[PDB]
RNA sequence: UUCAUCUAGACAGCCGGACGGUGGCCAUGGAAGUCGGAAUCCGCUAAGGAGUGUGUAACAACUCACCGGCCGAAUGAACUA
């Protein structure tokens, strides 16, 4: 590719059967970027790059895909290897069809290699494997030929094990094999690679033997048996001096001879071998010595681009063949819907259905070009389209826009080319849109077009921190930076905590630190401080108010006698879920509470209000016998209860599961002596006294965390849980795979650094997701400063600036 | 202690003067389960007695005063051997004794009598067992969702012992390189000893 | 990686050892007393901690 | 279509835990719900008793069948009105099994056991019962074992 | 000094077995000898703990008590100063 023309590239997109959309996936330091550079040295975050590959009719015939022509266009997305950026590879898999799995020969199949292979197999993407760093294997480990062959065999075996246990029953023959031509070998850094198909072709051109069976003979236990000219199938001991297999004899032998000669500086033996293998030199390549000479003679003898592109074209699926088995799972809408068939057929003349997945920054803050793939129809610059939100209901109105595209863009290696129109199954960018959809979503022209799938990723935002600007004046800048980061990063999450703190949640420590640097320097641009988030607790009771709490008014004319009770957890959950709601009418809510929750019907009928905020899981029950002016002080009692249940008496947190039974009140006859200013302080003091007398306790939020890790690493999960007070709930195994699923209750307090500790204990193989589940009562006394709950109460009091000692129940209590 | 040895002596005396024929049987490499199976088969038909060869020699020596005939047993009471006393057809008893041969697992560190060979077949186990094959370099591939050895491999050669990885793979594939049973060293009856054969 | 038999061979010299609790000397696994004079040839020995 | 065997142990009268049955039989073909209901049916007899439920797989079908166990048989022998498992630690396996039922259990055990006599098998089952902590004729099962050893009580040598 | 083992074979050393009822009863999410509470049985035994440790999520797999094969005459333990 010489960047022929925008219109020529448009014609290349028009030829849709001759385009290959693939993602390069590997472990972290396995070679992806260097191999992509070597692929673009003959053809030209994760943005697609374009590659041009010609072909002859002989190899075009050997393609099990509908095709027309001799030219192909490869759209390559180089996914990140790290586990903290697995959402980018998930998006790349959603937007592509094939996968180039780079495996380092020294390290073999690693944890992130298995992760990306599992993601591709779950997304129904056909893999092809390239074993990289063969130069490292040949110069560092000094393998002769058989250790190298065995390492290749083991790598292929491990990859095929992953493929067999994680491939869906829709392709079946998606296993990778070097004999089948789906495995290449080479050094991405040195710019050379080869396929045994290429070597079979070279030996057909040099010896005239058949290529079809030499393909399956150049690999495995196939021995040529020289000085006899008989292709034996086993060693047979070679009648002395056991013989070598075809792979080492014919494929590895010339490469190793070149390596040994050049790296041992056999300057007289270099030219003969070079002329024998038909390598030519340049003006200054003649005076090239070892480690610089081999580096070019390998690029000439075995072009890495010429092997990788041929493998991609021959084996990786085109969109017309991949969307056939991927449309059903990429569209929750029924399979008998014209949009579903349109995606299956990849017809460019159907209605437009384009999935935007990424937000590519544009060097202008707030534009964030919409990166994605069109699966059905053709998108046009200046075309009325419907933006659909990630949760857009297609029946009724939702966050759906009726807007128009301003410019269709060709995204390339950091340069955007305006394009007038792009057919289905291609990769493009959009200008003038995406102020309308937060994260992702589909652009449709049909009015009954269901939104596409939500692009679930194996990682989740689990490491949460609080962020606050140092300068209080640029809080709008912080908010804007948070909103722009929450759309630039697909897996980052921003929200408000229960304590009014901006919480940024990320996949892991490294991803969170990268996001925070992006906030501090690019998105927000203002100095901000990052801290562990403060945990919201609840104040509750665990007894029944050992003695009755009594409070007197400031004028001493009104008195309140009451008690505190531990509302049951089921009742609290029903109040929070709306089964027991304040807006529901009494004597029906009372009937529900009596029948389904063991409550007394009289008490449930005598429910005055809920707290806090009028709908919380706290109740006040009027158990008074014969109080006369009770309806007159009901409003003030409700206000005081809302105050007390919003600001509890221990450290000012919301109450939970607290039932305040007003056993008796004494009231002044005149209304002027029992107003709000007399009843509200009296009632809140009485409620505080009853709370502090009913064995005060605090409740903490507990996460429900489910972790997906292999069989070998569940012990690390269990050790981490036992070190951070986790309680295992359930263990399961995915049918057919060694992947377990451990569900456990981890307190939110002991959740900071949990992801890092789990990853260290499991060696990066565990994948946790954590969501708030419930509240757990801390058994320790929250009043003793040396208790487990007392330390957190003291810390909260210090952070809130209140006094050190929690006021005793004697305060708020009047002696009578 | 002495009382227990005296009790063993008494049991030996009763057996040697109540059961007409006896088999001196070697029991090397014979599991306790195998011995239990042998006893269960030989219920009624015979009774098995084991002991320390030295104590057996002492007991027989003491007995000789009354039963000098047993003097031909002493040269054969050596090695890891016990006695099967019987009042039944010699051939039948001998078949019941050496028919319980059991293929023992390929425990590690045990010299391989022959050249153990893993054979190209479809083992039919879950694919997550490929690590054991790779530990020995046995080329494999996934067929019908199960590991299948591609080419035959000499896992252990004759003369050497089994390593831990080799042992694990052999136990996975149920490949026992040896079988163990209660061989018969000697048969004694009518006051005379003779080789089993 | 190291082949398991060679790993066991290396572990025989590097890991399968005793350690004196008083002087930290690396001792034979079946030693009953430390060979060092500084510790008074104490019998207070422990196994060397196993990696993983 | 083979003699494949899984000797898991389930709680009597209840379906077998999916997490405890699926991991091994997921290639074979046995639908976990079918396996569960089959186990429940096979365990109806020993309702509410931990029982070893052996499974044979042929043509994608489970032959749920409760392999007799000493402890399980003893528990069913006391007739064990349905326990509240959640209630408390080791809800006591008290009561009074008798020679007749212990002999019956030993008769069901003889096939697999290696004792010479049914007396020996009864002593075995008696040791199991002693471990369980139940009573025989209000006498310690160890005492009953000693009685068997010393003649006072004689096992029917059938 | 005291108590023990020993030609009916001691100690050490090398090799073999180290089972069956049985995943003994119980919370446990899981606990199969080996996280724990109590229970310390029976069988076959020459002998084998309802288990001395390693190990597993649980298994499994190794190991030791205990008994054997080899050797053949003394040996072991706790103390005392
Ligand atoms: C998937 O995204 C989810 C999950 O990550 C999780 O549910 C997380 O939980 C946030 C918390 C929710 C808790 C309840 C609402 C009551 C108390 C709240 C917490 C503590 O203060 C517990 C978790 C952790 C958060 C504190 C520590 C900041 C919470 C909060 O919002 O304040 O919320 C995000 C949005
Ligand atoms: N010797 C050798 N080194 C390589 C090869 N491929 C990559 N590297 C080295 O790996 C390092 C980083 O690899 P990189 O491609 O950036 O990792 P990735 O793009 O994230 O997968 C570079 O410094 C290279 O020198 C190779 O084929 N041979
Ligand atoms: Mg890279
Ligand atoms: Mg354990
Ligand atoms: Zn020392």
- The CATH number of whichever domain residue A429 belongs to comes to 2.40.30.10
Phi and psi at residue A537, in whole multiples of 5°? -110, 170
* Distance from CA(C31) to C1'(E73), angstroms, rounded: 27
Domain C-terminal end among A258, A274, A302: A302
Q: In whole angstroms, what is the distance from residue D12 CA to residue A215 CA?
A: 59
- The CATH number of whichever domain residue A119 belongs to comes to 3.40.50.300
Q: In whole angstroms, what is the distance from residue D75 CA to residue D128 CA?
A: 11
Q: In whole angstroms, what is the distance from residue C11 CA to residue B160 CA?
A: 22
Atom of ligand 1 nearest to the CA of A466: 28
Question: With contact defined as beta carbons under 8 Å apart, do D56 and D63 qualify?
Answer: yes
Q: Which nucleotide is nearest to D11 (CA to C1')?
A: E23
Which residues, including other chains, have CB under 8 Å from residue D108's CB and lie 6 or more apart? D68, D73
A732 lies within 8 A of chain D by CB: yes
Angle between helix A86-95 and helix A111-122 axes, rounded to 10 deg: 40
Chain D touches chain C, with at least 3 Cβ pairs below 8 Å, answer no
DSSP 8-state assignment for residue A711? G
From the list B128, B137, B151, the residue facing A150 with the nearest CB is B137
Q: Is D19 close to A733, i.e. CB distance below 8 A?
A: yes
CB burial readout B111-139, b (16+ within 10 A) else e = ebeeebebeeeebeebbbbbebbbbbebb
Q: In whole angstroms, what is the distance from residue A687 CA to residue A644 CA?
A: 7
For E50, nearest residue by CA–C1' is D131
Picking from B36, B126, B142, B145 by the largest number of D CB atoms within 10 A of its own CB, the best residue to mutate is B126
Which residue do the tokens 């249940």 mark? A645
Which token pair is A287? 């005076």
Residues of B in Cβ contact (< 8 Å) with D27 = 126, 145
Q: In whole angstroms, what is the distance from residue A312 CA to residue A815 CA?
A: 87
For E21, nearest residue by CA–C1' is D124
State whether the beta carbon of B21 lies below 7 angstroms from any atom of strand E.
no
- The CATH number of whichever domain residue A494 belongs to comes to 3.30.70.870
State whether the beta carbon of B98 lies below 7 angstroms from any atom of strand E.
no
Mark whether A178 and A263 lie in a shared domain.
no
Among candidate residues A538, A543, A601, the one with its CA nearest the CA of residue A567: A543
State whether the beta carbon of D142 lies below 7 angstroms from any atom of strand E.
yes
Q: How much distance in Å is there from the Cα of A106 to the middle of ligand 3?
A: 18
Mark whether A585 and A641 lie in a shared domain.
yes
Q: In whole angstroms, what is the distance from residue A529 CA to residue A293 CA?
A: 53
- Mode of pairing for the β-strands spanning A183-187 and A607-611: unpaired
Question: With contact defined as beta carbons under 8 Å apart, do A739 and A765 qualify?
Answer: no
Mark whether A243 and A275 lie in a shared domain.
yes
Phi and psi at residue A128, in whole multiples of 5°? -135, 140
Which residue's CA lies nearest to atom 24 of ligand 1?
A748
* Distance from CA(B78) to C1'(E73), angstroms, rounded: 21
- In strand E, which positions have an atom below 7 A from any protein CB? 5-9, 16-30, 37, 39-48, 50, 54-58, 61-62, 67-70, 72
Half-sphere exposure of A219 (CA within 13 A, CB side): 24
- The CATH number of whichever domain residue A612 belongs to comes to 3.30.230.10
From the list A153, A161, A163, the residue facing B139 with the nearest CB is A153
DSSP 8-state assignment for residue A250? I
Phi and psi at residue B52, in whole multiples of 5°? -75, 125
Among candidate residues A721, A722, A742, the one with its CA nearest the CA of residue A732: A742
Mark whether A673 and A792 lie in a shared domain.
no
Q: Which nucleotide is nearest to B3 (CA to C1')?
A: E8
**Chain D 59-118 contacts with nucleic strand E (CB below 7 A):** 68-72, 75, 85-86, 88-91, 93, 109, 112-116
For E8, nearest residue by CA–C1' is B55
Q: In whole angstroms, what is the distance from residue A478 CA to residue A528 CA?
A: 8
Cα A14 to the center of its chain, rounded Å: 33
Domain C-terminal end among A247, A272, A302: A302
Mark whether A589 and A629 lie in a shared domain.
yes
Among candidate residues B122, B95, B117, B91, the one with its CA nearest the CA of residue B194: B91
State whether the beta carbon of D131 lies below 7 angstroms from any atom of strand E.
yes
**Length, in residues, of chain A:** 816
Omega of the bond prior to A612 within 30 degrees of 0, cis?
yes
Chain A touches chain D, with at least 3 Cβ pairs below 8 Å, answer yes
Give yes or no for residue A533 CB within 6 A of ligand 1. Answer: yes
Among candidate residues A311, A748, A812, A755, the one with its CA nearest the CA of residue A537: A748
Q: Phi-psi bin for B32: left (phi > 0), alpha (psi -120 to 50), beta?
A: alpha
**Chain D residue with Cα closest to B37:** D114
Atom of ligand 2 nearest to the CA of A28: 20
State whether the beta carbon of D145 lies below 7 angstroms from any atom of strand E.
yes
Which residue range(s) make up the domain with A31? 1-195+303-318
Angle between helix A269-276 and helix A253-263 axes, rounded to 10 deg: 150
* D74-78 contact pairs (CB < 8 A, 24+): D74/D102, D74/D105, D74/D125, D74/D128, D74/D129, D74/D132, D74/D134, D75/D46, D75/D49, D75/D50, D75/D132, D76/D45, D76/D46, D76/D49, D77/D101, D77/D102, D77/D104, D77/D105, D78/D134
Q: In whole angstroms, what is the distance from residue A299 CA to residue A277 CA?
A: 13
A730 lies within 8 A of chain D by CB: yes
Mark whether A751 and A809 lie in a shared domain.
yes
Which token pair is A462? 């689990």
Atom of ligand 1 nearest to the CA of A701: 22
* Distance from CA(A780) to C1'(E79), angstroms, rounded: 51
From the list A153, A165, A234, the residue facing B127 with the nearest CB is A165
The count of domains in chain A is: 6
C6 lies within 8 A of chain B by CB: no
Give A157 to chain B, closest Cα distance, Å.
7
Q: Is D19 close to A732, i.e. CB distance below 8 A?
A: yes
Mark whether A284 and A309 lie in a shared domain.
no
Mark whether A33 and A74 lie in a shared domain.
yes
State whether the beta carbon of A731 lies below 7 angstroms from any atom of strand E.
yes
- The CATH number of whichever domain residue A759 belongs to comes to 3.30.70.240
- Mode of pairing for the β-strands spanning A126-132 and A183-187: parallel
State whether the beta carbon of B79 lies below 7 angstroms from any atom of strand E.
yes
Give yes or no for residue A772 CB within 6 A of ligand 1. Answer: yes
Question: With contact defined as beta carbons under 8 Å apart, do A424 and A380 qualify?
Answer: no
Separation in Å, CA D47 to CA A401, D75, D102, D125 = 61, 10, 19, 21
* Distance from CA(B59) to C1'(E9), angstroms, rounded: 13
Mark whether A89 and A173 lie in a shared domain.
yes
Q: Is the dihedral of CA A690, A694, A698, A699 positive or negative?
A: negative
Which residues, including other chains, have CB under 8 Å from residue B134's CB and lie 6 or more apart? A154, A157, A158, B140
To the nearest 10°, the Cα dihedral for A779, A785, A790, A795?
-170
Q: How much distance in Å is there from the Cα of C23 to the middle of ligand 5?
A: 4
- Mode of pairing for the β-strands spanning A353-360 and A441-444: antiparallel
**Chain A 514-533 contacts with nucleic strand E (CB below 7 A):** none
Mark whether A94 and A43 lie in a shared domain.
yes
- Give the count of beta carbons closer than 10 Å to the beta carbon of residue A419: 22
Q: Is B134 close to A161, i.e. CB distance below 8 A?
A: no
From the list A730, A731, A736, the residue facing D26 with the nearest CB is A736
State whether the beta carbon of D130 lies below 7 angstroms from any atom of strand E.
yes
B36 lies within 8 A of chain D by CB: yes
Domain C-terminal end among A538, A562, A585: A538
Q: Which of A23, A26, A28, A31 to mutate to test the pocket of ligand 2 (most atoms within 8 A of CB)?
A: A31
* Distance from CA(A207) to C1'(E78), angstroms, rounded: 87
Residues of B in Cβ contact (< 8 Å) with C4 = 135, 163-165
User: Using H for helix, E for strand and C for coil, what is the string for D115-134?
Assistant: CCCHHHHHHHHHHHHHHHCC
Chain B touches chain C, with at least 3 Cβ pairs below 8 Å, answer yes
Which residues, including other chains, have CB under 8 Å from residue A115's CB and lie 6 or more apart? A83, A86, A458
Mark whether A279 and A370 lie in a shared domain.
no
Q: Is C5 close to B163, i.e. CB distance below 8 A?
A: yes
> In which element (H, E) is residue C49 found?
none
Question: With contact defined as beta carbons under 8 Å apart, do A564 and A623 qualify?
Answer: no
Which residue do the tokens 């807006």 mark? A583
Mark whether A797 and A671 lie in a shared domain.
no
Among candidate residues A72, A71, A132, A124, the one with its CA nearest the CA of residue A99: A124
State whether the beta carbon of B105 lies below 7 angstroms from any atom of strand E.
yes
- The CATH number of whichever domain residue A266 belongs to comes to 3.90.1430.10
Q: How much distance in Å is there from the Cα of A33 to the middle of ligand 2?
A: 7
Query: Within 6 Å (CB) of ligand 2, which residues are found?
Result: A 26, 28-34, 81, 132-133, 135-136, 187-189
């Amino acid at each position: 590719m010489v960047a022929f023309t925008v219109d020529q590239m448009r014609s290349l997109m028009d030829k849709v059967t001759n385009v290959r959309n693939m993602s390069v996936i590997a472990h972290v330091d396995h070679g992806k970027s260097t191999l992509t550079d070597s692929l673009v040295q003959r053809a030209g975050k994760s943005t697609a790059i374009s590659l041009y590959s010609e072909m002859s009719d002989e190899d075009v015939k050997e393609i099990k895909q509908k095709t027309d022509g001799n030219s192909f266009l490869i759209n390559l997305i180089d996914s990140p290897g790290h586990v903290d950026f697995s959402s980018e590879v998930t998006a790349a898999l959603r937007v592509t069809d094939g996968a180039l799995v780079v495996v380092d020969t020294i390290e073999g199949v690693c944890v992130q290699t298995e992760t990306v292979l599992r993601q591709a197999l779950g997304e129904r993407i056909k893999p092809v494997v390239v074993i990289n760093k063969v130069d490292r294997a040949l110069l560092e480990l000094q393998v002769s030929k058989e250790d190298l062959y065995q390492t290749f065999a083991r790598t292929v075996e491990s990859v095929n094990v992953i493929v067999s246990t994680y491939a869906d029953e829709v392709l079946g023959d998606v296993q990778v094999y070097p004999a089948r031509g789906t495995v290449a070998f080479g050094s991405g850094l040195h710019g050379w690679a080869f396929t045994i198909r290429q070597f079979a072709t070279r030996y057909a051109k040099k010896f005239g033997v058949d290529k079809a069976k030499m393909m399956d003979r150049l690999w495995g236990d196939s021995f040529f048996n020289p000085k006899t000219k008989k292709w034996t199938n086993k060693d047979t001991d070679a009648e002395g001096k056991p013989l070598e297999r075809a792979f080492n004899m014919f494929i590895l032998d010339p490469i190793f001879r070149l390596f040994t000669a050049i790296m041992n500086f056999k300057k007289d033996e270099i030219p003969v071998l070079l002329e024998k293998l038909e390598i030519v030199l340049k003006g200054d390549e003649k005076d090239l010595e070892g480690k610089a000479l081999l580096k070019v003679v390998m690029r000439k003898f075995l072009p890495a681009a010429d092997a990788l592109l041929e493998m991609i074209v021959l084996h990786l699926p085109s969109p017309v063949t991949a969307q056939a088995y991927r449309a059903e799972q990429l569209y929750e809408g029924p399979a008998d819907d014209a949009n579903c068939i349109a995606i299956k057929n990849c017809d460019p003349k159907a209605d437009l259905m384009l999935y935007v997945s990424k937000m590519v920054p544009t060097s202008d803050k707030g534009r964030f070009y919409a990166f994605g793939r069109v699966f059905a129809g053709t998108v046009k610059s200046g075309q009325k389209v419907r933006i659909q939100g990630p949760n857009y209901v297609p029946g009724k109105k939702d966050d759906l826009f009726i807007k128009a595209i301003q410019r269709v863009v060709l995204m390339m290696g950091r340069f955007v080319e305006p394009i007038d129109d792009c057919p289905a199954g291609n990769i493009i960018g959009l200008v003038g849109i995406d102020q309308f959809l937060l994260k992702t979503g589909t652009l449709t022209t049909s009015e009954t077009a269901h939104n596409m799938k939500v692009m679930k990723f194996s990682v989740s935002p689990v490491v949460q921190v609080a962020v606050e600007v140092k300068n209080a004046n640029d809080l709008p800048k912080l908010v804007e930076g948070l909103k722009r980061l929450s759309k630039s990063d697909p897996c980052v999450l921003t929200y408000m905590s229960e304590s009014g703190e901006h919480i940024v949640a990320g996949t892991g420590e490294l991803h969170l630190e990268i996001c925070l640097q992006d906030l501090e320097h690019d998105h927000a641009g203002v100095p901000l401080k990052i801290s562990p988030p403060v945990v919201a607790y609840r104040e509750t009771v665990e007894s029944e108010s050992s003695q009755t709490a009594l409070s007197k008014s400031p004028n001493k004319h009104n008195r309140i006698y009451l008690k505190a009770e531990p509302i049951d957890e089921e009742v609290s959950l029903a109040i929070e879920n709306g089964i027991i709601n304040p807006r529901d009418d009494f004597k029906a809510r009372a009937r529900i509470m009596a029948d389904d929750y063991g409550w007394d019907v009289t008490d449930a009928r005598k429910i005055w209000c809920f707290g806090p905020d009028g709908n919380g899981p706290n109740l006040v029950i009027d158990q008074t016998k014969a109080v006369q002016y009770l309806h007159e002080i009901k409003d003030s009692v409700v206000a005081a209860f809302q105050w007390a249940t919003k600001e509890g008496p221990i450290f000012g947190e919301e109450m939970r599961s607290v039932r305040v039974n007003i056993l008796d009140v004494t009231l002044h006859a005149d209304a002027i002596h029992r107003g709000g200013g007399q009843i509200i302080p009296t009632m809140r003091r009485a409620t505080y006294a009853g709370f502090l007398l009913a064995d005060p306790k605090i409740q903490e939020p507990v996460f429900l965390v489910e972790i997906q890790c292999p069989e070998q690493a569940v012990g690390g999960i269990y050790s981490v849980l036992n070190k951070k007070r986790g309680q295992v709930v359930s263990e399961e195994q995915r049918p057919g795979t060694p992947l377990f699923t451990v569900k456990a209750y981890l307190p939110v307090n002991e959740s900071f650094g949990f992801t890092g500790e789990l990853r260290q204990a499991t060696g990066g193989q565990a994948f946790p997701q954590m969501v708030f589940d419930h509240w757990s009562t801390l058994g320790s006394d929250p009043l003793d400063p040396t208790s487990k709950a007392g330390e957190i109460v003291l810390a909260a009091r210090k952070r809130h600036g209140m006094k050190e000692e929690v006021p005793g129940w004697q305060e708020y209590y009047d002696k009578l | 202690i002495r009382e227990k040895k005296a009790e063993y002596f008494a049991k030996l005396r009763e057996y040697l003067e109540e059961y007409k024929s006896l088999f001196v049987v070697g029991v090397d490499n014979v599991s306790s389960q195998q011995m239990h199976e042998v006893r269960k088969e030989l219920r009624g038909r015979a009774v098995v007695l084991m002991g320390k060869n030295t104590m057996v020699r002492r007991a027989i020596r003491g007995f000789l005063s009354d039963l000098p005939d047993f003097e031909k047993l002493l040269p054969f009471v050596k090695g890891n051997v016990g006695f099967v006393f019987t009042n039944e057809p010699l051939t039948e008893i001998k078949n019941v004794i050496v028919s319980n041969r059991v293929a023992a697992p390929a425990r590690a560190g045990a010299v391989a009598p022959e050249d153990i060979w893993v054979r190209a077949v479809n083992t039919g186990m879950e694919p997550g067992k490929t690590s054991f094959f790779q530990a020995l370099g046995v080329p494999t591939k996934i067929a019908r969702g199960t590991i299948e050895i591609v080419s035959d491999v000499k896992v252990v050669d004759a003369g050497n012992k089994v390593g831990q990885s080799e042992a694990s793979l052999l136990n996975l594939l149920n490949i026992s390189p040896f079988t163990f049973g209660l061989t018969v060293v000697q048969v004694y009856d009518n006051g005379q000893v003779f080789p089993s054969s | 990686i190291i082949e398991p038999s060679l790993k066991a061979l290396a572990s025989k010299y590097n890991c399968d050892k005793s350690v004196c609790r008083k002087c930290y000397a690396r001792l034979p696994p079946r030693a009953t007393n430390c060979r060092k004079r500084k510790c008074g040839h104490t019998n207070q020995l422990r196994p060397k901690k196993k990696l993983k | 279509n083979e003699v494949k065997y899984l000797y898991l142990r389930a709680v009597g009268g209840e379906v077998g835990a999916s997490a405890a049955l699926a991991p091994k039989i997921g290639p074979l073909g046995l639908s976990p719900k079918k396996v569960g209901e089959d186990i429940a049916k096979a365990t109806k007899e020993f309702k509410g008793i931990k029982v070893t439920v052996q499974l044979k797989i042929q043509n994608r079908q489970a032959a749920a069948s409760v392999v007799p166990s000493a402890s399980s048989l003893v528990i069913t022998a006391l007739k064990e009105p349905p326990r509240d498992r959640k209630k408390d630690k080791n809800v006591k396996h008290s009561g009074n099994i008798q020679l007749d039922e212990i002999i019956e259990i030993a008769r069901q055990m003889r096939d697999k056991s290696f004792g010479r006599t049914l007396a020996s098998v009864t002593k075995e089952i008696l040791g199991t019962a002693q471990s369980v902590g139940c009573r025989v004729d209000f006498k310690n099962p160890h005492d009953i074992i000693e009685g068997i050893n010393a003649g006072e009580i004689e096992i029917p040598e059938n």
